[PDB]
Ligand binder design. Structure first.
Ligand SMILES: [Cl-]
Ligand SMILES: [Cl-]
Ligand code: NA
Ligand code: NA
Ligand code: NA
Length: 214
């Protein structure tokens, strides 16, 4: 079973990763994990990836595809794999096709932007400990205060609404053509594509996935 799992930053697609891994007996792989691990191995691909990153340079599509091809040839991908958050562009998806890396399912984990914004901007944090509260989902016991220390809660610059919205805008401009690419691949019979409603409770999403996948 070969699955691509896509989703907007903050949508929460990772909430279903362990269910998929345990359903098929397949690992979760990501280009980020490949890039951070490339150094650990002695492969020449990894050394080439190390030097790119050490020079602050962009990882080219050709290199990332090589790393993906390398990763799925490892023994743990014999039942398949859950490719998390890649491809990100049409040129990357075509490079997968050029390399011969087809998958059985493309899952788009879909949560509307407004709900992602609400989830993130409602966060309140105790920065010294990393404790995280949410005004609606998990409020502090005492208003504005960390339960443990009583210190006044703050918010993160990375969670500012304008910053989240800019991130989502950029995501959809990159991902909309990719989604259409995979829908066309599915109409051609090369793969299966499904839009997954990620606003439902996790257990209901899990059930939905069972119906989509089999
Ligand atoms: Cl997320
Ligand atoms: Cl307490
Ligand atoms: Na891993
Ligand atoms: Na959309
Ligand atoms: Na506002």
């Amino acid at each position: 079973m070969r699955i691509i799992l896509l989703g907007a930053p903050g949508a929460g697609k990772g909430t279903q990763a362990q269910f998929i891994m345990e359903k098929y007996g397949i690992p979760q792989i990501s280009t980020g994990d490949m890039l951070r691990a490339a150094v650990k191995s002695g492969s020449e691909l990894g050394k080439q990836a190390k030097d790119i990153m050490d020079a602050g340079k962009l990882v080219t599509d050709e290199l990332v595809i090589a790393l993906v091809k390398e990763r799925i040839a490892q023994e743990d991908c014999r039942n398949g794999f859950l490719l998390d958050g890649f491809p990100r562009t049409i040129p990357q998806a075509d490079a997968m096709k050029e390399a011969g890396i087809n998958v059985d399912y493309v899952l788009e984990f879909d949560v509307p932007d407004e709900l992602i914004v609400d989830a993130i901007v409602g966060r309140r944090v105790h920065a010294p400990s990393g404790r995280v509260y949410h005004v609606k989902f998990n409020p502090p016991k005492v208003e504005g205060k960390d339960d443990v220390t009583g210190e006044e809660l703050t918010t993160r610059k990375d969670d500012q609404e304008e910053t989240v919205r800019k991130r989502l805008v950029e995501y959809h401009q990159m991902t909309a053509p990719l989604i259409g690419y995979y829908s066309k691949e599915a109409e051609a019979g090369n793969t299966k594509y499904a839009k997954v409603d990620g606003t439902k409770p996790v257990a209901e999403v899990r059930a939905d996935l069972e119906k989509i996948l089999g």
